[PDB]
Write a protein that binds this ligand. Sequence first.
Ligand SMILES: CC(C)C[C@@H](N)P(=O)(O)O
Ligand SMILES: [Zn+2]
Length: 864
Amino acid sequence: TVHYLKDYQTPAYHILKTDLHFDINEPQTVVKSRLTVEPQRVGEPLVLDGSAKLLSVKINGAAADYVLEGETLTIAGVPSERFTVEVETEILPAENKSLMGLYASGGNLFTQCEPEGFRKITFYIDRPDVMSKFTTTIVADKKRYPVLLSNGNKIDGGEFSDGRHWVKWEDPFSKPSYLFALVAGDLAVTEDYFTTMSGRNVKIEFYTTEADKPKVGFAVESLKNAMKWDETRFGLEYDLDIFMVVAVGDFNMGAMENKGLNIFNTKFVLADSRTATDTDFEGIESVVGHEYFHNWTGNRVTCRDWFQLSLKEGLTVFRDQEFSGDRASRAVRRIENIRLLRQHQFPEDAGPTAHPVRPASYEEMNNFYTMTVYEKGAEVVRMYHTLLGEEGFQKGMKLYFQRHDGQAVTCDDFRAAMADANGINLDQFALWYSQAGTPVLEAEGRLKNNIFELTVKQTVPPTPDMTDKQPMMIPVKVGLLNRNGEAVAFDYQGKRATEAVLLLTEAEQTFLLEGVTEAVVPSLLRGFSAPVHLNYPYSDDDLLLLLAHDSDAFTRWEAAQTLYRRAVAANLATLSDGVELPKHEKLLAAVEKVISDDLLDNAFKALLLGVPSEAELWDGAENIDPLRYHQAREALLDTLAVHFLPKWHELNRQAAKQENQSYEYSPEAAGWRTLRNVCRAFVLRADPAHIETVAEKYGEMAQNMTHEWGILSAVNGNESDTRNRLLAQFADKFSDDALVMDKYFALVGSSRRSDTLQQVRTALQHPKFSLENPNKARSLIGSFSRNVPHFHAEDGSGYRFIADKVIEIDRFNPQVAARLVQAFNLCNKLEPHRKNLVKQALQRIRAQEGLSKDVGEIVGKILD
Ligand SMILES: CC(C)C[C@@H](N)P(=O)(O)O
Ligand SMILES: [Zn+2]
């Protein structure tokens, strides 16, 4: 069964009220529902999704005639007007390792319903265009389960003689089933509040383990920032007098926006300076923000169907990105977002699983929680902002909510509102949702008479879903610099400005920027103005100029990225010829000017010193030997490390001095640490023996996790025995901290040392490792899967190991397995010996009896 967007039809039934009652016992939990049903297409059979053990079903209090087949329950004869359905189900939550539905974690009970988990709790119409008002009663042993939560307001509760107690939660806002949540357990509470702009108090409650409670203060503060910001930037206000957040250690995703009761992977909720990196702190802020932002972009307005997922996720990622940029370091954070997009989304769009931001079809929707839908999604939203300016963007938002509050809508609807609110036509803009693949811009510039003539071509390649790709609406932001690097004005569309947005809408256009009276070098796609590859024929000297002098952060960074890229290409040539490495003399010149320029933002400096990844370097190539790209990259870094070794120590020391013992998270302090960690990595490349020194004062350097992580990362590839001793000490010191143990496993899994495969196989049996825990599994196995020299070992060991673990995880958690199997996405682009080995492994996965739909769908795309 494949689901197609073209077949969407409205539901035959609506569900008006959903009354749930949960009776929690050992080992089983019994769910009794009462649904109020409203026929839309009278006489149609009533069709309910469900997979929990069914004990009884009734229509108006009476035993119903029905049939159960697969995961559907069908009742043929049903009233021609309002009726009730009552379903009784039974669940064994300790047996649930998929972590979808109602499941156990650390002795407590949690739910995860998006996208189709609710049907694992009860039989229901489990689709997001069906919206109902829920009231949830929960009964459980008081001592084992003192804390009992669901969405909305708590309106009643009591005690029973036998030790049980009960609560009743009423959520007055209609909602689709994926936004339901229940939590039951012995949990510590952290209390606070925010007062909305119209003077209402909102009680905030974070729930964690008793031991984890001291690590939740920064999450709380981030939430209060996020609430404030949604008021001031979007005019959005919270709509209940309670907001609850619950941390859980077994969780497949990052976090979940259930209405008034968000549930969060601990890793996006818990931090202190001793156990979390500054980056961990920044993740907490974006993710807490993100989930709070969903309250409007997702909850108040939800999705008509899952094909529309990006209507909530692209827009909400844009929101969280804007929140973080407004808090601090906007340009640096923009680049970070771009780099992530190019490093993970682009390879997606170039590979077997490429899909549109709004898929036309899917077998299993859990496979479409992807970088394309989320990050490419946010870029598309961002382009509306680019075309319309902030004020015009907020007008779209207003009309969006005016029209669609309380509805389940589509990406077309969102487009229409940005279009109608500003009286502009965005018909062509729809292709950003329906056409997959990364557009490629070919660009030429000519200065003749006093005009700079900029010719621009676009193609979008075929992807596996679609061959025909029509030209798109693509904004390209541009500047010019003279030989001395200063801004240059030009005349475009009437105005004389120093920058413009050129709007490419055709296969090829020329843009005339008139009034130029200097030799100029153009700066293109400023701010990464659209998610595309641009080729322009720049000299190295042109790049050196852009880098030293250009006013836009991205374009300066892209220029360094481009030099790094050219240097790696040069390295591949010589190593391939068996000759000495190139001298990269201009590059080294440029790095030196970056290292030494003290007017550069510290974090930005750090990004300028980052070399593109192996996946970026093999973009577009065929017959890839990943190790040869890896050896080329490694050679560059070794050259940079050795060549500038003493400047790496000095930068380090300047950064230490600037940090000034301010060990707590702050954007300012974090910037210095980011730079200090880049130096540590280069130093330990050039001089692995410096590890013994580092060890001698480890205590003294380990003033926070940012420092321990950065030192541990820098040595992680060192073949010294000391590397192993330090990891073992790290495991020992932080053995009770599960999020820190995830770091240990990530280090084990990512190491470039020659023995990583066996060290990984020992880690599987470490007393703190659980294959059944998604954080752990990703940490060790996911990391190994991305470890280029080891995953792509010529002997096939890496591919065989990963394929076994795909097979093994998929028996309890198909989601984690389907994410893992994507490590093989490069299959058809590898050189023949590795391709054969990859194809064998994918055949072996395919051959497993009982293989999930999740993994099957992915292996099909790679193999067939
Ligand atoms: C699948 C679900 C738990 C995650 C999303 N709704 P996000 O808010 O993490 O995007
Ligand atoms: Zn989300």
